[PDB]
Design a binder for this molecule. Structure first.
Ligand SMILES: O=C(O)CNC(=O)C(=O)O
Ligand SMILES: [Mn+2]
Length: 429
């Protein structure tokens, strides 16, 4: 049902369909040559240059090389400079250009294309919404906000605009205000609203205002295929891995690592405390977004399977000890770090980025009261010299209401059911 032919193109249809059918066939290099060999025959053929662009685009995905895709991007541009272009074609051409620009990471370039599209089609609400995304991708939330306010002023019930507007409000720390927009947008069922990210932000927003209803939406998100479960909501996952919030050492199979940590715990403690005393600067503040209040800092020895040399100079014995255990030092999706938390601290409920790791906590300095950690429905406490093990892809939450500082040692390990080849293959997080 789209009109892709000006007065010109209608005359040469039998040829255009030929070159097109070639592409549909998958015999690409020819459709290219075909399409290439039609502009010289007739330069002012939008449907010809557009065709060429598609081939280049199609070819980009086959060759999987960004240089050819860059070619397509300009060819799409060329379509829009021709004398008489069908509205549908012009729109298709530039929209696709913008999308590919975003794919390459040319965010401001995509934005410029979207700005052009919006002035070319002032009445297309779909394109205004896309422009808003353009602004978001360069971090210009203020202009994005203006865009979605325009849309909503004309189309009060556009779901796409609502979830994005809600997102923007939440990013501006207007948490409570963001929730109705996120809800209504998702409930609209409009194209682009069935996105895990909006379930994430909606749930997060509700939890930060104490609305227990958040779990209803996490459950819905799970049923929509956005989360592994109501509790397990990590983004980068491997299917088939045993999924439970709390693990015993025996269940993990990493009994020797655990034994080594527990048996040498005073040593691990003392080197961490020595850094605190003599080089407190190496303890960096933890994720500000996860901290409601209080004081919370970390000192990393390993990150994504990479040893931090300067840090291991501060805790040489501890690093020497860990070298023996590649299941953690080689875990490219985990870390090894000291974590200190002071009284009056609360960490928002949250989830890790992957189900490919388990997280061990060795207690080093644990006040007799006030410190606890919940993972899923079970809350537990640390013990000095003892290891806790949980799957941090499950929602967990932390409190520190003691009268003195709490120090733990965090050791990530590969999920034990991951194969050697999997461990070798997975990219880092
Ligand atoms: O240091 C703490 O108490 C908080 N730790 C976590 O949330 C974690 O290990 O994933
Ligand atoms: Mn955590």
């Amino acid at each position: 049902k789209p009109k892709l032919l000006n007065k010109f193109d209608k005359t040469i249809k039998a040829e255009l369909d030929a070159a097109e059918k070639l592409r549909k066939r998958g015999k690409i290099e020819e459709a290219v040559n075909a399409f290439k060999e039609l502009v010289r025959k007739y330069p002012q053929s939008p449907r010809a240059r557009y065709g060429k662009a598609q081939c280049e685009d199609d070819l980009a995905e086959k060759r999987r090389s960004n240089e050819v895709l860059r070619g397509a991007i300009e060819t799409y541009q060329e379509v829009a400079s021709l004398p008489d272009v069908p509205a549908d074609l012009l729109k298709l051409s530039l929209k696709r250009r913008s999308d590919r620009q975003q794919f390459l990471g040319h965010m401001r370039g995509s934005l410029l294309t979207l700005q052009r599209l919006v002035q070319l089609f002032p009445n297309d609400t779909s394109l205004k919404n896309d422009l808003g995304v353009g602004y978001l991708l360069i971090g210009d939330n203020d202009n994005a906000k203006k865009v979605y306010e325009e849309v909503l002023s004309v189309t009060p019930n556009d779901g796409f605009a609502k979830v994005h507007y809600g997102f923007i409000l939440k990013a501006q720390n207007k948490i409570a205000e963001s929730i109705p927009y996120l809800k209504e947008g998702i409930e609209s069922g409009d194209p682009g609203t069935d996105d895990g990210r909006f379930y994430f932000h909606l749930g997060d927003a509700m939890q930060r205002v104490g609305n227990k209803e958040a779990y209803k939406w996490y459950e819905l998100g799970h049923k929509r295929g956005h989360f592994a479960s109501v509790w397990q909501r990590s983004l980068y996952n491997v299917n088939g891995l045993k999924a439970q919030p709390w693990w015993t050492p025996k269940e993990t199979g990493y009994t020797e690592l655990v034994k080594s940590l527990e048996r040498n715990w005073k040593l691990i403690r003392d080197e961490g405390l020595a850094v605190m005393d003599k080089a407190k600067g190496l303890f960096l503040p933890e994720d500000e977004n996860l901290r409601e209040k209080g004081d919370w800092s970390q000192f990393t020895l390993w990150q994504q399977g990479r040893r931090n040399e300067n840090a291991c100079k501060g805790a040489p014995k501890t690093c020497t000890l860990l070298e023996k255990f590649p299941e953690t030092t080689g875990c490219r999706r985990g870390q090894i770090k000291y974590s200190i938390m002071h009284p009056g601290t609360h960490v928002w409920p949250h989830t890790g980025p992957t189900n490919c790791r388990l997280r061990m906590h060795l207690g080093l300095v644990i006040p007799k009261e006030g410190c606890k950690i919940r993972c899923a429905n079970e809350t537990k406490t640390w013990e000095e010299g003892k290891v806790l093990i949980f799957d941090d892809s499950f929602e967990h939450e932390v409190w520190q209401d003691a009268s003195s500082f709490r120090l733990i040692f965090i050791v990530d390990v590969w999920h034990p059911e991951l194969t050697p080849q999997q461990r070798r293959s997975l990219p880092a997080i």
